[PDB]
């Protein structure tokens, strides 16, 4: 009847996540547990002998609520423990780059429904060098920044990177962020001037 604990949700996709937990607290290890979904309009009640569950068929940018309750026999139920789980936005799609003239590189992508903002990470590759972290992109807007300046201190995204130095190879690594403050999986692209 002892509550669950060290609860953790391994995110495999923006559509399914694996909840894995522990219980013990005396009585060795031989119990049964019940999980509850609240994805509204329908209430789902999953019961698993093992201390882990596969929750599938979820929405990317939305957060669901789950409750885990350990049981032993029948009415022999224990206590409820509740977790709030946010899933990943769909990663940025149509990731593209188009360099215009040796010191300038334009890179375009299409965000997706769930995304509210993007986080780009720009790095040079090979130099006796930068690694800037362009936080807070927006969908549908057009940006244009010299990233080397920042070192010293429809629904698409249009970002031109100027002031680039020839002969050096760059990576752009773009992550999709949601209003709930949770990053999706990254999408990278390379270009060299
Ligand atoms: Pt469900």
UniProtKB/Swiss-Prot annotation:
Residues with glycosylation annotation: 24, 54, 74, 113, 133, 153, 171, 180
Post-translational modifications reported in the UniProt record: N- and O-glycosylated.
Location in the cell: Cell membrane; Cell projection, Ruffle membrane; Cell junction
Tissue expression notes: Expressed in the promyelocytic cell line HL-60, the granulocyte-macrophage colony-stimulating factor-dependent leukemic cell line F-36P, and the IL3 and erythropoietin-dependent leukemic cell line F-36E. Expressed predominantly in epithelial cells and lymphocytes. Enhanced expression at high cell density.
Record function comment: Tyrosine phosphatase which dephosphorylates or contributes to the dephosphorylation of CTNND1, FLT3, PDGFRB, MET, KDR, LYN, SRC, MAPK1, MAPK3, EGFR, TJP1, OCLN, PIK3R1 and PIK3R2. Plays a role in cell adhesion, migration, proliferation and differentiation. Has a role in megakaryocytes and platelet formation. Involved in vascular development. Regulator of macrophage adhesion and spreading. Positively affects cell-matrix adhesion. Positive regulator of platelet activation and thrombosis. Negative regulator of cell proliferation.
Family: Belongs to the protein-tyrosine phosphatase family. Receptor class 3 subfamily.
Subunit structure: Monomer. Interacts with CTNNB1 (phosphorylated) and JUP (phosphorylated). Interacts with FLT3 (phosphorylated). Interacts with GAB1 and GRB2.
Protein name: Receptor-type tyrosine-protein phosphatase eta
Organism: Homo sapiens (Human)
Region of the whole protein represented: 119 to 364 of 1337
């Amino acid at each position: 009847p002892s509550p669950v604990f060290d609860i953790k949700a391994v995110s495999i996709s923006p559509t399914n996540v694996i909840l894995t937990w522990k219980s013990n607290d005396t009585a060795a290890s031989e119990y049964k547990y019940v999980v509850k979904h609240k994805m509204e309009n329908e209430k789902t009640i999953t019961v698993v002998h093992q201390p882990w569950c596969n929750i599938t068929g979820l929405r990317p940018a939305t957060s669901y609520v789950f409750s885990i309750t350990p049981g032993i026999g029948n009415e022999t139920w224990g206590d409820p423990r509740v977790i709030k789980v946010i899933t990943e936005p769909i990663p940025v799609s149509d990731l593209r780059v188009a360099l215009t003239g040796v010191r300038k590189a334009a890179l375009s992508w299409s965000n997706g429904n769930g995304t509210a903002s993007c986080r780009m990470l720009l790095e040079s590759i090979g130099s006796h060098r930068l690694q800037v972290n362009i936080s807070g992109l927006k969908p549908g807007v057009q940006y244009n920044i010299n990233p080397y300046l920042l070192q010293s201190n429809s629904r698409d995204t249009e970002v031109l990177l100027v002031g680039l130095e020839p002969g050096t190879r760059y990576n752009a690594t773009v992550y999709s962020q949601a209003a709930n403050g949770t990053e999706g999986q990254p999408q990278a692209i390379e270009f060299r001037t």
